[PDB]
Every structure is written in C-alpha cells, then in structure tokens.
Amino acid sequence: NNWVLLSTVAAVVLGITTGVLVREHSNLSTLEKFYFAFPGEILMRMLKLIILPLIISSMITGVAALDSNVSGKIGLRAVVYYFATTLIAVILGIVLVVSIKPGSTVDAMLDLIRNMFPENLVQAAFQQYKTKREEYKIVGMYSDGINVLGLIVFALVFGLVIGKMGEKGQILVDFFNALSDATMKIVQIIMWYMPLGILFLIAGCIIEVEDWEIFRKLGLYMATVLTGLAIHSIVILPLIYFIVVRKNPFRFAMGMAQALLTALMISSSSATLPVTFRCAEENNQVDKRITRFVLPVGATINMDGTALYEAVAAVFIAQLNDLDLGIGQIITISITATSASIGAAGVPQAGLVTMVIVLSAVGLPAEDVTLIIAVDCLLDRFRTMVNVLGDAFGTGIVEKLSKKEL
Amino acid sequence: NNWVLLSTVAAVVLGITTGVLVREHSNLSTLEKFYFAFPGEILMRMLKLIILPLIISSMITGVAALDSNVSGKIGLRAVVYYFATTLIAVILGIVLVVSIKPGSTVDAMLDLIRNMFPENLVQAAFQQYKTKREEYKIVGMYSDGINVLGLIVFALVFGLVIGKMGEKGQILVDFFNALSDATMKIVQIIMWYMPLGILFLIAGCIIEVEDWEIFRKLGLYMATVLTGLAIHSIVILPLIYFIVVRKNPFRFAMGMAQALLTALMISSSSATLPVTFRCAEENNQVDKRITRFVLPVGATINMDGTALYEAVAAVFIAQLNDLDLGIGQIITISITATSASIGAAGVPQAGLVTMVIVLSAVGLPAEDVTLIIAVDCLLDRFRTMVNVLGDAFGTGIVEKLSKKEL
Amino acid sequence: NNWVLLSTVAAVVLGITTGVLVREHSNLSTLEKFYFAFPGEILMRMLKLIILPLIISSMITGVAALDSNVSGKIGLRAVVYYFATTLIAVILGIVLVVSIKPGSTVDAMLDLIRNMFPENLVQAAFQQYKTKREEYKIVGMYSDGINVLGLIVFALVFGLVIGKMGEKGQILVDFFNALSDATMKIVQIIMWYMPLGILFLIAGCIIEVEDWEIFRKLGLYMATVLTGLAIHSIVILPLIYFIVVRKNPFRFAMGMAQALLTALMISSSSATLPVTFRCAEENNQVDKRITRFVLPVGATINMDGTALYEAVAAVFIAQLNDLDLGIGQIITISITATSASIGAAGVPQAGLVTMVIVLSAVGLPAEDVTLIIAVDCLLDRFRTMVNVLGDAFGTGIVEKLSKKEL
Ligand SMILES: N[C@@H](CCC(=O)O)C(=O)O
Ligand SMILES: N[C@@H](CCC(=O)O)C(=O)O
Ligand SMILES: N[C@@H](CCC(=O)O)C(=O)O
Ligand SMILES: [Hg+2]
Ligand SMILES: [Hg+2]
Ligand SMILES: [Hg+2]
Ligand code: NA
Ligand code: NA
C-alpha cells in the first residue's frame, strides 16, 4: 500500500515509547547511551554522505534547464521571493524573541563574503574558511565542515554558463541530469533504512534528558519558536500567496498534506523532495517546467523556519548570558541567520553546525549550543514542515507570475 | 618477443644479487640506505596514485555492465563465493597459527561500520575515520589514509542505480567505461618503468636486514604463513572448484601459469589484471560477459592470502607480547581480517596499512608492524599469487553456475 | 566600444592616485590597511578558485586535440622550445645577478621528483608533499598548497592516453572540451569585476610602504630584474624568432600589442588568454590547429620572466644574508627556478608561494620573502608581459617548424 509514512509514524511512536520506558526503567551510563543510538548515527552518516552530489547536481540542472532567454526572469522571480520570505521570517523571529524575552563582528561579517568565493573547489567540499585577529593583524585558517555557501554560488554560475553555451555544452547538461537523478535514486534507497534509523534517533534523543528541569527551564523559549513558526506558516505565507494569486491558500496546503506530514516525520526537506514533487504536480496541478526548478533549488536555499529558529535561538542564548544587544548587534544576527539558512543542508542535525557562525558573530563561545541542544529535535520536526511549505507556496506564486511565459 | 615477465625475472635476480653484494661488501648509513631505494619509492608513489580511479571505475563499470534482471543473480553468486573463500582462508590461518604457536574492541568493531558510510565523498578519498574513548565518552576524528571500504560500497550502489536507470543514465555508463579503460592504459604505461623500480624495491629491501638474527627469529612464523598459503592454494581451492564443476582443477591453474608468474614477480594483483584477463579468456575459454565482472571487481575485494596473512600475523604478534587470547578475541581478529582483505588495494605495500586496524582491534600498539616488516616482501610475493588464483577459480565456478543464463 | 583595457587603465591610475593620497593624508593602522584592500582579496580568491579546472581541462584538451601521429612531433617541438627558452632566461638572470651583486639540498631536489608523482589525485588538488631529515632519518608530511606540478604531469599523460584511444574515448574528449570552454566563460565573467578589484589591489599595495627607505634599499635589485627582463624580451626572444622564421620579429610584437598591454595591466597570463588568442589568430594570421595547443598549454608552463625573477630574487636574498654560494649551489637554484616557473599558476600573487621551495633549496628560512614583498607587484606587472610574449613567439616558431604537417 502506502508504507512511506505509515512506517515512519509507527517508527516515531515506537521511538517515543522506547525512550520513555528505557530512560525510566533503567539507568544507563553515557557510554551505553551513545552505543544505544548507533543506528541513528549511521542514518545521519548516510544522509550527510548524500548531500554534496545532491546539492551540486540539483543546482546545476535546475539552472541549466531554463532557456537562455527565460533564465533571468524565472531565476529573479524565485530569488526575490526566497530573500523576501526569509527576511520576513527573520524579522518576525527577532521581534517575537525581543518582545517575549525568554531570558570583532566585522571579521565574522567578512568571512561570509570570503566563503562565497573559496580558494579551492576540492577543499570547499569538506573545509571552511575562518579568520581571527591576533597580535592586531588578521590570521586566517581552514577548519573542517563542508562549505555549502561557496559550492552553491559556483554551481549557480556554472549552470548559467552551461545553459548559455547550448548544444556545444549539452554534454555537461546531460551528465549532470543523470547524476542528479542517480542521487535521487540513492535517496530513495536510503528511505528504506530511514524508519529504523529514526526510531533510535528519537529514542536516544529523549534519553539524554537528565531531569526534565531542562525542559522546564527551556520553557518560554520553545513557545517563542513555535509561535513564530505558526504565525509565519498560517498567516504570513497564505497572505502573500493570496495577494499574488487570487486562490484559496489553504486548499494548496491541504493538497500538500502528504508532503507536510512526511517532512514533519522525517525532519529532512531534501529526502521528502519526491513527495513534494508528486503532491505539487499530480494534485495541485502545477506546471512541470517551473516546479522542476523551484523545488530542487529551493529545497536547500529557501529555509524560513531555519532562519527564524537561528535568530530566536541566538537572541535567547544572548539573553541567558546578559550581554544586552544594541541595534547594530541585532542586524548582524539578522544577516548571518539569513546566510545560515542558505548554508544548511536538508538533513536533521543541520542548523546546529551553521548556528556556530551566528553565535560567534556577536562574540559568543561555540559551546553555548548545548544550552538548547536538549530539545532541538522537537523544534526541528516543525522547522522542516515550514521549510517545505515555503517552497510549495513559492511554486504557485512563481507559476502565477509566469503565466505569460508558459 | 615477450618481455613482460622476462624483464621482471631479470630485474628480480639482479635485485637479489645487488642487495646481497652491497649489504656485505659495504656498510651504508640509514640515510644512504633510504636514498638507495628511491626508484622503488617512485614506483610505489605511481602505483598508489593509480588505485583510486582504478577502483572506482572498475566497480562502477563491473556492476553497471550486468543487465537489471541478471545483476542480482551474478552479483550474489560472486559475493557468496568471495565471502565463503575468505572466511575459509581466515579460519585456516587462525587454526594453523594457534596449533603451531610460533611465539575497547567494540569501538574498533563499530569503526568498520562507520567507515562503510563516510560523511563525505571527497574526504573519503584520502582520509579515514576512527574513534577513541576518553574522559568515558567517545571522541571521533579523521586521520589520513584512503577509505577504500566506503568508496567500494558507494561505487557498488552507484553502479546498481545506474544500471537500473538504463538508456537515460547510459551517459554515465559510457563515461565510466572510458575512464576505466583509460586507467588500464595508464597502468600499462607504468609497466614499462615497473622492472627498474622492482629491482631497487627488492635490493633495498634485502639491505635493511641488520644481522640475519631477525630472519632466524622470524622462523616458524614464516613457515606458518607459507603452509597456510600452500594448503589454501593446492587443496581447498581445487577441491571447491572440482565440487562445483567436474573438471580437472589443475589444468585451470596450468593455463593461468603466466598470470600466476606475473603476480608472483610483481606482487600486485591490480597491475597483473590484463595478463589474468588474457589467460582466462584466450586459453581457459571463459565467457567474456562474466569474466569482465568477476576479474575487475574481485581484483581488490577477493584477497584470500591477504586475509590469511593478516590473521596469522596478528595472532603471532599477540603471542610475541603474551596477552593470551580468548575465544572472543579470536572472533574480532577473524572479522577484522576479512575487512582488512577487502580494504587493501592491489599494491605491494598494502596489507601493512590495513593491519593497523586488526592490531588495534585487540588493543595493541601500531608500532608492532616493525616486528615482521623485515621479511614482508617475500610473503607478499606469495600472497599475490593466491590472491589472483582465487579470482581465477571463482571465474570458472561462477561460469559453471551461470550456464543457464548464457 | 573596447572597455577591456580602457577600464583597466582607469582602474590602475585611480589605484595609484588613491594609494598615494591615502598613505600621505592619513595614518591608518595595520588592521584598517587590511580591511582597505578587501576587494583585491576577493578578486584573488576568485582567481585562485578558477585555476584548477582551467589547468586540468586546458592540458587535457590541448594534448588530446592533436592526432595520434602528430602528437609526438608538435608536443616535442613545443616542449623543447619551452625548456630551452626558460633555461636561457634562468642563465641570463643568474649571470646578471652575480655580475651586478646588489647585496640538505638533496632532500629539496628529490621533493620535486616526489611531487611529480603524487600518492593521491584528490589530495594533490590542495596539498603538497615535503620531507625533512631528523634524528638521521627522513620524515615526510603533507602541507597545504595545490600541487600544480603533479596535476600537470597527470593531465598530460591522461590527454595522451585519451587521444590514443580514439572514437571509443571520444566522450572524455568532449567532456573536457566543454569543461575547458565553461572555465573560459567563467573567467570572462570574472573580467567584469577585475577592474574594481585591481584598483584596491594596487592601492593597498602602495599603502603598506612604511618609509620609501625600503624602496631605496631594494634599489639595484629592481634594476637587475628589469634589465634581465628587457634583455630577454627585446634581444634574445626576437633573435631566436628570427633564426627560425625569416620574418621581422618586432612586427609580431606590434601585432600582439593589445595582449601585451592587457598582461601588463592585469598581471595574469591565464586571464589574458582570450586576448592573446584573438591577437595571434585574427592579426598575426597563425594557424588555429597549432595555436589552440601552444597557447593554453604554454599559458602556465612557459613562464620565462617568472623563472628569471625567481633566480635573481633567490640569489639577491642569499647575498643579503652572506652565505657565499658555490658552483653547486648555483645549479640547484637554476633547476628549482625552472620547476618554480612551471609550478606557478597564471595569477598575480603566484611566484611567491613557489619561491619558498627555491629558497629552502639552498637552506634559507621561508620568511625572507618579506625582504622583497614590498615592491613585488611592480615586477609582476613586467613578468606577466614577457610570460605572454614568450608564448606568442613560441607560436610562430612552432608554426614555421610545422609547415610540412599543415
Ligand atoms: N531540518 C532542515 C535542515 C536545517 C535545520 O534543521 O535547521 C530541513 O531539512 O529543511
Ligand atoms: N599484494 C596484494 C595487496 C595486499 C597485500 O599485499 O596484502 C595484491 O596486490 O593482491
Ligand atoms: N604573473 C604570472 C604568474 C607567476 C608570477 O607572478 O610569478 C603570470 O600570470 O604569468
Ligand atoms: Hg528529539
Ligand atoms: Hg623483500
Ligand atoms: Hg604593487
Ligand atoms: Na526564504
Ligand atoms: Na527548503
């Protein structure tokens, strides 16, 4: 029948039950807790393995698919929508976190421009650049971690160039089309192992909770993120959809119910891409030419909930450490969180590796992620839902704004 | 005429003569000894350069060549034979080494599963993952050394996916076919320099022998390995060949005499692949469709003598250090040695870099390889012979077991 | 109209004016000086990003374009001319620097052979090998920095192999042709940002001059380099051109005036390749089949002024530190400087990273590059001009020596 989401629902309920029963009926040491969540670790190792070919091939094929005369218009209509919706999300998150109050920046601002143009393509696949001043002179070095931001820019430029070359460069277009669909097939292969991995990934996640006092203390912060996500998903996005196209926005969401449920269960926007494609094309009746570009490109660039969570978490951690923020310190968080959303891949544990940059932007230690790591999975489950909903709503907007070219 | 093996025989006899005459008539320092064996070092740098494209392209083309309906059957018939023959070799080696007696394991057991699914494809080409516990919590880091095990798994999955896609993904099949045959051409180019490199590689190998007391002390251990190789090559493999196909097993070996001699002289199963192909196809009259898959895939996965040597050497080093082994400690050696055979490339100095993992599995320092490094080349010369003989015997077995599909 | 060089001339004059006016009218700290030259840093990050695909694809396509029967002859006629002209340049530089007098080698000599055959293709793209002796035994390790020398050799061998395979390996030829022209398109895209980057790259270069006493002290050394470049560009190259082909050498230079001006303004031989192509083909009326091979291959291998500058700077730094040089110490500089010219890419700051090897060849600290870093841009501007002039003159020589095969 349809085991794609039934198996995942069974896995998540079994994971919750197993974690609760084990944590209570037993007292395991930290080493045994680490050994317990090994299958989830293997699932995460596979998901992180698949991202690089996925991102590179998806960007290249999405940009090169557009004809030379329409690449500018459709690309602009997509990028403007992405930037506007993410800025709205960041502003809403900052405003809400400031109102509720749950609790060397230039170097980090220039490091973002330095990482858009890496010095080496091979090294950018597994290493990232960072500079720190010392005596005052600037010293730069390469740390570990894939440089998604530079690879995305290079892939966009390469796709545009190959699309402009035409029949002479058609061989590269064919090569990257085949590579992208091979990567999609490999992701479909991983979806078989996904449920058993998710079971342990959540069971061992609800086991490390030492006393629930962490859950009580992280209260109010969790409400701020959930309220921001609800406002951005139920109010702002349907409103901007209705403004562009005069259609009932909620019928679109109801048609994208399967994709939303899959995203909320697996917490990965890149692995739910086929379901989103099917729901958008077969049900909502969206043109293929534009969705084939909006979906794969926006599955890792357009992440509104991720940006909102980055801004809210950064300001909350700052408030936990005092360090009253000025107006200028608000802005550097807003811009960095926008880059952090673009710099994170469609995998669960993403959004924590990219939060180090936004934390160091305002001069904070990298170890403060542990202040909120405890309950991050529950918020990730809801971040992914709005990350894919934004992509779906962008699809209808671009389609309505591209009627004259179809 | 036929200079492929005549030149190699001349090179090996000249190397033995040169090493003996130099070591005796002269007293060189360690720096001069290092400078003496420079051409062998260059040959090894070239052979290690060629392995990565060779392995990747060979696995991809071998798996994608099979049709979608026959890929499962032939692949299963090959992998079952590989696993069974290697397990037999490991068991025989362990039994012999235990009888003759010449003299934190869970982390190393899970590192093997962690290395089958690397977190990065580019980083897996030159780096490997390892975890060590410290206070107890697990800390992981990436050391140097190509991750052959993860690349093999990814290449197998990619080849299966591309074979299933068909005419749409035929461009990748063509690309990797061309890449594989280009790599074979480059290996044929290196075969010109091979003889002069081998001359110094053995001359400087028989020079570092300080007093022959090392040869006397390593006695009994060398007998255990040679007896195990002889038993596995003369008895077990012909018997399992005769059981499957009712033909004289020794006629097959006699037809593969040129390949066996080349493997025994150059000590590299990947560089003797064309000779093995020629001997199996032109003389033994083996079908091309199945040999084109069994030979290149099995030239680095199917290594029986390597696994036997790993097990015997690990147990011998353990006995030199006391540390009486339990039944459980025998098993972790057996499984790790099976992975070590798969994880080693078809190059001479391989089998020593992969022995560090099997030594650390039972909690031993990485510097104990020096206890047997002195006479390792002589045992490598015989390991390669049985490594290629196992591949040849597997070819006839799979062919006889694949008559109905040809 | 023609904004390619008018904009660059405006940028260079504005950069000189801005640097002079700022350095005098203001007293900035070192951190502010570093922040001032940020756009030049971004331009350099982009230029260093583009070199690896450019080099690999250019070598592969240039070698594979030649037919199997003519690849040996044309390749030999090009490589002999390259080696002879570079040796002449090195000898002239050494002679001039010795006459004017402005002021563990075996390990560094064998490291060059070790770097021609790297142990890993992926690691060679961003790392380089070096050995140092310690107690005496040799210990080797990998430092950072792209290994251009090994990649060039592998690309040459791969191109020859693919050209010999023919229609069977034509898919790789097509792939690399498309990749090379895509890289050229990306370089043309970077040429838009080039002028604004050059403005700051020179403005902040003439700002770090502390007191002009450095300019006075570096006098005589600058004259030695300029005189060597003038002699090699005005006398030796036209003479060797006239000897081969009985045509007026200076008419060729006058036709290559646009390319020479572009090279002198942007100080990058790889980014001025399209202009050199246009000037050589449309004006000088050179056959396309031979220029398509001589230009892209020689744009990074044939660098005469770079080698002359390396030799002169190394001997000048040695004379600043006393350390009287023997005849043997002259030779190791000459051979290393020849490799340093081949090992440097067509980017401005190149020639300083490759000078560390030639400085360590004679046993000198790597920090002595700061003795001449102050005025290096002015000498680079003239190095690039002769680097492209040598390529142009080689084109006519090979064409005249290849009449019978066209
Ligand atoms: N879960 C996100 C990745 C980024 C994040 O978790 O913050 C997604 O797949 O859309
Ligand atoms: N000599 C082996 C490689 C592995 C080893 O030496 O143990 C072969 O080429 O088959
Ligand atoms: N500027 C040189 C690069 C090498 C050097 O600067 O020494 C060129 O592009 O030709
Ligand atoms: Hg969780
Ligand atoms: Hg040996
Ligand atoms: Hg300058
Ligand atoms: Na967005
Ligand atoms: Na998304």
Ligand code: NA
């Ligand atoms: Na992202």
Ligand code: NA
């Ligand atoms: Na085996």
Ligand code: NA
């Ligand atoms: Na083998």
Ligand code: NA
């Ligand atoms: Na192996």
Ligand code: NA
């Ligand atoms: Na030259």
Ligand code: NA
């Ligand atoms: Na040049």
Ligand code: NA
């Ligand atoms: Na060069």
